[PDB]
Amino acid sequence: GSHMEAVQNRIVEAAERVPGVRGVIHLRARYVGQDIWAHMIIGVDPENTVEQAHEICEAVQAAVCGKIRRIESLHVSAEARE
Amino acid sequence: GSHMEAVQNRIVEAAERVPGVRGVIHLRARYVGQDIWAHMIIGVDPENTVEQAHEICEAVQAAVCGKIRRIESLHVSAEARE
Numbered sequence A, B: 001g002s003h004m005e006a007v008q009n010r011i012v013e014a015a016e017r018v019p020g021v022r023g024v025i026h027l028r029a030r031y032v033g034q035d036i037w038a039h040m041i042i043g044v045d046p047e048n049t050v051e052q053a054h055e056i057c058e059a060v061q062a063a064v065c066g067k068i069r070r071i072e073s074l075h076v077s078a079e080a081r082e
Helices: A003-016 A050-067 B003-016 B050-067
Strands: A024-032 A035-044 A071-080 B024-032 B035-044 B071-080
Touching (some): A003 A035, B003 B035, B003 B050, B050 B071
Antiparallel strands (some): A024 A035
């Protein structure tokens, strides 16, 4: 239920502390048993390169999964944000 | 049960990221309903002043309670550690 809300706040806060993240644009997190599977979209600088945006996504995946132990799948993508 | 273990790891990691903490010496955390009440003892530099040790304890209380939302009481004390 709304113990999902507290986990979601953790996910957003963890993603936002990674260098290059300009906000979490979208987060869809689901329980698969006691595990969380999630998809997220982060904002990035429009003038970052596609490669850099991919690096930031992987840094976000690593930070979030590193801080939130119950997460077992996280897909991070990126969109331009000012 | 052992969802307490994951919360306890969060508490120790949060305390250890505060300036002046040389390890968590002791942590006793209990559920009061869905809330956690905790007592912890941190290690500090023997040559810190009593006042500085009190500051570090309050910084730990603030960091931990700030990161772990279900915590509703936390008492932090300090002991000398090399």
